[PDB]
Amino acid sequence: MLLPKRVKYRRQHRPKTTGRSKGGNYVTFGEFGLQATTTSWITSRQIESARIAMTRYMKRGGKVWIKIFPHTPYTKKPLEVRMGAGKGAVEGWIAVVKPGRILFEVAGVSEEVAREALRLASHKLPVKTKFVKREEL
Amino acid sequence: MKQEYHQVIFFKFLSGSTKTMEWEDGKEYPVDISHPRQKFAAADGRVERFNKKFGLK
Amino acid sequence: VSSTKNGRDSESKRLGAKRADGQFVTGGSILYRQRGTKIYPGENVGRGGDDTLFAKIDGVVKFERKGRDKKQVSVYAVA
Amino acid sequence: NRLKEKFNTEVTENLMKKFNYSSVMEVPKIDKIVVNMGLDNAVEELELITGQKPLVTKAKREGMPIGAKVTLRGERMYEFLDKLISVSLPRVGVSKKAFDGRGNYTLGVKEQLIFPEVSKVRGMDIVIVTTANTDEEARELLANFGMPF
Amino acid sequence: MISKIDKNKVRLKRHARVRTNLSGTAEKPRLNVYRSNKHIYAQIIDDNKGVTLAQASSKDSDIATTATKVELATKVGEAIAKKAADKGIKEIVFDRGGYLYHGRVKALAEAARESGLEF
Amino acid sequence: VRVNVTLACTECGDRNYITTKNKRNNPERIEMKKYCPRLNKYTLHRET
RNA sequence: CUGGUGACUAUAGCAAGGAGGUCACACCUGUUCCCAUGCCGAACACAGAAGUUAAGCUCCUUAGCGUCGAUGGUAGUCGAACUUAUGUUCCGCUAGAGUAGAACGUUGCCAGG
RNA sequence: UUAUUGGAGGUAGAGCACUGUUUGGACGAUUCAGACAAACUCCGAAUGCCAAUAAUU
RNA sequence: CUGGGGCGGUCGCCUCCUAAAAGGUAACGGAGGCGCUCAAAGGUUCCCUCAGAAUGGUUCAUUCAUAGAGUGUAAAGGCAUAAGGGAGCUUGACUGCGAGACCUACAAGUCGAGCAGGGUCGAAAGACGGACUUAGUGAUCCGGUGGUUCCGCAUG
RNA sequence: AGUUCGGAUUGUAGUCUGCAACUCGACUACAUGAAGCUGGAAUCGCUAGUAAUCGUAGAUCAGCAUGCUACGGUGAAUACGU
RNA sequence: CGCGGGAUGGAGCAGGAGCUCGUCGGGCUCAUAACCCGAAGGCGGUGGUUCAAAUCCGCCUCCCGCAACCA
Ligand SMILES: [K+]
Ligand SMILES: [K+]
Ligand SMILES: [K+]
Ligand SMILES: [Mg+2]
Ligand SMILES: [Mg+2]
Ligand SMILES: [Mg+2]
Ligand SMILES: [Mg+2]
Ligand SMILES: [Mg+2]
Ligand SMILES: [Mg+2]
Ligand SMILES: [Mg+2]
Ligand SMILES: [Mg+2]
Ligand SMILES: [Mg+2]
Ligand SMILES: [Mg+2]
Ligand SMILES: [Mg+2]
Ligand SMILES: [Mg+2]
Ligand SMILES: [Mg+2]
Ligand SMILES: [Zn+2]
């Protein structure tokens, strides 16, 4: 599971999820990519499951770039407690994903093989995705 | 300079120092090692040492 | 149950601009409250012990550029 | 000084011949000599071997004195270099690869007894700083001046 | 190598730091001193208007000779004070120019003081 | 460490100046020149 | 044209190449006098003039780093209508980034030529 | 209240020049590319606010 | 006070974020600090410029280095005019005030040009009514101590 | 005085025996110059020509003895008592 | 579930690292133990404050004490 080695503040306000993707909207390292078309938090466990699906389908022969990182911690209260008495403890780490953002990139395989690997990864994610290639012209 | 060290004569040549002899200038100053000739011949070498020891040319 | 170790803040100091550019001020009027020289004293304007900028004469306040990355405030007599 | 007269003589002519200079102001010369003994006994030994009062260099517990140093320039520096070349050096050749990459040289002496003028033999270092723009130019100038390279 | 210092630019930085709180106005202009290796020049400036009213120099035909540098600075101070008195100048503020108030700069200041300028 | 100090000069009973000092750093009775309103002049005020 | 001293957001700087020095500005020579070094005539200060453009400095050329910088479009957003959609529509304002491009300073006063 | 004009300030957005987070290259930490931030900012709106002298009230 | 009460935690002051680009703005929201220190770490005049890295030397030297250091202390805002570093003299870490402002329910809190009296530093212009700024504090009543052209119960 | 005490270790050059001194001999010369400044708990020998100390010889044996066996020179202190 | 305390040679205890036993070597003994003489050997961790950390900041892995209710 990806997570920062350290952060300055462990308790953070949850990020704003309205709007469109600030950047990373293009394939820059690989040949094909998976582009989000809806918005969600993406957790490190979801990232790991999607990455495992992709790498298993391409037999660790091509190469994958994970374009998102879960920089943001989020807290959760302990079970069966009333409101108040301070913020809860860190539960996990999320990345903010908005329409346009490229989630994964792959290179070194055919278009059909990449499409299938990315479909398998997409079914592990809480967002709708589209197969994309590097933009030319 | 703020307000010892004079010009002593150390061959002979003028110099300044604190660890305190007429000169061609006509004045006198307070007055082992010339450092090494070949000193000693280098090692003969094992072949030459062998031949010289036993007279084997 | 638990408890929080936070919950402290000091009183707000009401800093910032106290008179407008182009406004007429009597001598001694405080023009700017600040920590440090966020704005510098210009013509006919003094800097207090706690960095307060105040007018030294009666006149009109002018906030102006001071170099590339600084600014100042002056007071010019109306006449 | 004898070395001063040698430098004012055709030594600069040799440097101009060997480096193709257009004016005599571009001929490199030794700017100064800084002697650092990295402490009353050390300060006194350094003063008695050099000639002037040393400067005590503190730390940047921080601030305590650690070493002593002396800077020489002019007649005193020239006399010191002549004495180092003649009377002092053979008692201790010297490294010819200890250059700063700009034209200044440094040499470390471990025993202070090599000076004509101690209970714990401490080691000091000498830095000869010149107006030479290259290590090659500085080395050629020093060799002409007579450094036992 | 060993870089130089550029005495003139070191002087300029010091002079700007002096001019931070030293300035000359209409009722009390600034007598600014500039001093090169061989000559000393003095000006009377109304920094409020950015205008120079009197000036003197050790290279001025009337105030140039072969003499001591201190004496030449004295003569330049006297000339500048005489010109200021010819104009309507009595009180000034002395801009030493970023040099220490000693030697030639002091001689010029003292000469102007003796010849009539009030500072 | 730090204690309150009252300074009074010889020819006055005004005792108008109070100040602070470090008893460890300054074990002596501190002296200073201070303006004395009664005499309209500066006088040598010394810690009591 | 040079120099002093000001004003202006580096369009003014930095860097890389050339030309210059009679007066001037300098590097320079000396430590006797004012003065000065936690040590040093290095700097500060004073006397000067053998020497040199070598450097600082001035003029010419480079858009190389920095600096400035549109138009057009986009993000965002005041207001309005729809709407509950990680929203839509209309209107006004309008970035940041990036592009064309600008820029190797302009200019007041005084003195010298 | 609106119009015009001047000003103070660092949000939205954006950006990575600082602090911190992070993904691939290359080279002998530097550089190249690409991302993240309430307590990051080389930047920076719309608004709102403070004032000055015309229209309406 | 309290997402019932209890138990736990908290209670005044300072700094930051939340705070929506003036100011203000809540929660048992997110982070820290204070209940001092300094006889110079105050005033003034003069001088000075840092961290880091590389290169050589049994801290010393060179070049890049707008601060990436330092600023007594938490943070923020500032500062190479240096507010950072050093040196000489010094005590303005004065007395009587104070136009006019900020803040504010009140009581309080904050800034302040100038005026007079006497000084310190500086050649001089000038600066100085503590400290780069913002915490380091507690009303009244009562009692102690010093001063006092005040009162003091018929008069002294 | 770790020294004009000490001579371990090491370098070099040799002598002799032996067919042959690398492993692995003895001795010599020059140089080098270690630990060691009277030794914890504990423990050994010795009653007189003994202990201590100093030399000498022999067997084995080409060469190799700080061991063994033997020889003399100098030569003590103490034993109250079980 | 809330509040707090502890992690020290190999063992039990002291606390900006010492007592006792344990190990090793030697001694005593026919031998062992006991006993005697010498030698070696240590701050639970993870990040920070700090010129410097067993010491201080927070947390982590376990143990330990009070409490975990009025319905
Ligand atoms: K960054
Ligand atoms: K509540
Ligand atoms: K706020
Ligand atoms: Mg981008
Ligand atoms: Mg102040
Ligand atoms: Mg104050
Ligand atoms: Mg944002
Ligand atoms: Mg409750
Ligand atoms: Mg607002
Ligand atoms: Mg606000
Ligand atoms: Mg607290
Ligand atoms: Mg407290
Ligand atoms: Mg101060
Ligand atoms: Mg009575
Ligand atoms: Mg009475
Ligand atoms: Mg011997
Ligand atoms: Zn008094």
- Listing DSSP states for A11-51 in one string gives S-PPPP--S---S--S--SSSEEEEE-S-EEEEHHHHHHHH
Residues of E within an 8 Å Cβ radius of D: 1-2
Residue A47 CA, chain-centre distance (Å), reads 5
For ligand 17, the distance from its centroid to the CA atom of residue F24, given in whole angstroms, is 26
Q: At what angle do helices D12-19 and D135-145 cross, to 10 degrees?
A: 140
Q: Does residue E11 form part of some domain?
A: no
Q: Given an 8 Å threshold on Cβ–Cβ distance, is D51 in contact with B16?
A: yes
DSSP classification of residue D7: I
How many angstroms separate the most distant Cα atoms in chain B?
77
Q: Given an 8 Å threshold on Cβ–Cβ distance, is A86 in contact with C1?
A: no
In the beta sheet, which residues pair with residue C61? C75
Partners of residue B5 in chain D, C-beta under 8 Å: 51
Q: Which two tokens stand for residue D19?
A: 């480096």
- Of B13, B17, B35, which has the smallest distance from its Cβ to D2's Cβ? B13
User: Would you tell me how many other CB atoms lie within 10 Å of the CB of residue A9?
Assistant: 7
**Do residues C74 and C47 lie in contact, with contact meaning Cβ atoms separated by under 8 Å?**
no
Q: Which H/E stretch holds residue A131? A: strand A129-133
Phi and psi at residue B45, in whole multiples of 5°? Answer: 100, 145
In angstroms, the CA D60 to CA D46 distance is 22
Residue A40 CA, chain-centre distance (Å), reads 9
Is the CB of C8 inside 8 Å of chain A's CB atoms?
no
Q: Given an 8 Å threshold on Cβ–Cβ distance, is B19 in contact with D116?
A: yes
- Could you say which of 3.90.1170.10, 1.20.1250.20, 3.40.640.10, 3.30.1060.10 is the CATH number of the domain covering A24-137? 3.90.1170.10
Instruction: Give C46 CA → G19 C1' in Å.
Output: 52
Which residue type, as a one-letter code, is found at position F3? V
In this structure, chain D runs to a length of 149
Which residue of A lies nearest to C3 if distances are taken between CA atoms? Answer: A85
Strand K CB-contacts below 7 Å:
A 6, 78; C 1-3; D 61-62
In angstroms, the CA D115 to CA D87 distance is 8
CA-to-CA separations, E76 to A58, D136, E11, E54, E85, in angstroms, rounded: 91, 50, 21, 12, 14
Q: Does residue D48 form part of some domain?
A: yes
In angstroms, the CA D110 to CA D121 distance is 8
CA-to-CA separations, A109 to A113, A130, C77, D121, in angstroms, rounded: 6, 18, 78, 72
**CATH at residue E68:** 3.30.420.100
In angstroms, the CA E9 to CA C74 distance is 31
Interface D:E, Cβ pairs < 8 A: 11
DSSP classification of residue C70: E
Alpha-carbon dihedral sign for residues A10, A11, A17, A19: negative
**Do residues E52 and E32 lie in contact, with contact meaning Cβ atoms separated by under 8 Å?**
no
Instruction: Give A5 CA → K46 C1' in Å.
Output: 12
Tell me which nucleotides of strand K come within 7 A of a protein CB: 1-3, 47, 51
Residues ending a continuous segment of chain B before a break (C–N > 2.5 Å): 3, 10, 20, 31, 33, 36
Way the structure was solved: cryo-EM
Domain ranges of chain C: 15-79
Q: Which two tokens stand for residue A118?
A: 């990315």
In this structure, chain E runs to a length of 119
Helices assigned H by DSSP within A74-134 = 111-122
Q: Does residue E26 form part of some domain?
A: yes
Half-sphere exposure (Cβ direction) of D116: Cα atoms closer than 13 Å: 24
**Do residues D75 and D4 lie in contact, with contact meaning Cβ atoms separated by under 8 Å?**
yes
Q: Which two tokens stand for residue D37?
A: 């003994």
In the beta sheet, which residues pair with residue A42? A95
Which residue has tokens 């966020």? C38
Q: Which residue is nearest to nucleotide I148 (CA to C1')?
A: F14
**Do residues D53 and D35 lie in contact, with contact meaning Cβ atoms separated by under 8 Å?**
no
Cβ-in-10-Å burial (0-12, 13-18, 19+) of B34 comes to exposed
Which residue has tokens 């490190």? A44
E90 touches strand I (CB under 7 A): no
In angstroms, the CA D134 to CA D146 distance is 18
What is the extent of the structural domain holding E59?
21-110
Q: Does residue E1 form part of some domain?
A: no
The strands making up C70-76's β-sheet, listed across from edge to edge, are: C24-25, C59-66, C70-76, C40-41
Q: This structure's resolution (angstroms)?
A: 2.2
Nearest to E81 by CA among E45, E109, E107: E109
Tell me which nucleotides of strand H come within 7 A of a protein CB: 5-9, 12-16, 20-25, 33-40, 43, 50-52
Which residue of A lies nearest to C6 if distances are taken between CA atoms? Answer: A86
Q: Which two tokens stand for residue D107?
A: 């040499």
**Do residues D9 and D88 lie in contact, with contact meaning Cβ atoms separated by under 8 Å?**
no
Number of domains in chain E: 1
Q: Which residue is nearest to nucleotide I60 (CA to C1')?
A: D36
* Range list of β-strands (E), A60-101: 63-66, 72-76, 89-97
In the beta sheet, which residues pair with residue B6? B17
Q: Does residue D53 form part of some domain?
A: yes
User: Would you tell me how many other CB atoms lie within 10 Å of the CB of residue C1?
Assistant: 6
In angstroms, the CA C13 to CA C34 distance is 9
**Do residues A92 and A17 lie in contact, with contact meaning Cβ atoms separated by under 8 Å?**
no
In the beta sheet, which residues pair with residue B25? none
Is the CB of A86 inside 8 Å of chain C's CB atoms?
yes
Helix, strand, coil shares of chain D as percentages rounded to 5? 40, 25, 35
DSSP classification of residue D97: S
Nearest to B15 by CA among A31, D88, D54, E113: D88
**CATH at residue D75:** 3.30.1440.10
Q: Does residue E10 form part of some domain?
A: no
In angstroms, the CA A34 to CA A27 distance is 9
Return the HEC string of D9-54: HHHHHHHHHHHCCCCHHHCCCEEEEEEEECCHHHHHHHHHHHCCCC
Partners of residue D49 in chain B, C-beta under 8 Å: 18
Partners of residue B33 in chain D, C-beta under 8 Å: 90-91
Q: Which two tokens stand for residue B7?
A: 């010009």
**Do residues C48 and C63 lie in contact, with contact meaning Cβ atoms separated by under 8 Å?**
no
Q: Which two tokens stand for residue F27?
A: 């074990």
User: Would you tell me how many other CB atoms lie within 10 Å of the CB of residue A26?
Assistant: 14
Residue E109 CA, chain-centre distance (Å), reads 7
- Of B2, B10, B19, which has the smallest distance from its Cβ to D86's Cβ? B10
Number of domains in chain D: 1
Half-sphere exposure (Cβ direction) of B56: Cα atoms closer than 13 Å: 8
In angstroms, the CA B25 to CA B12 distance is 13
What is the extent of the structural domain holding D84?
4-141
Cβ-in-10-Å burial (0-12, 13-18, 19+) of B15 comes to buried
The pairs formed by D135-140 with CB atoms below 8 angstroms and a separation of 24 or more are D135/D99, D135/D100, D135/D101, D135/D102, D135/D103, D137/D15, D137/D19, D137/D28, D137/D103, D138/D28, D138/D99, D138/D103, D138/D104, D138/D105, D139/D96, D139/D99, D139/D105, D140/D15, D140/D18, D140/D19
Q: Angle CA(A27)–CA(A29)–CA(A31) in degrees, nearest 5? A: 65
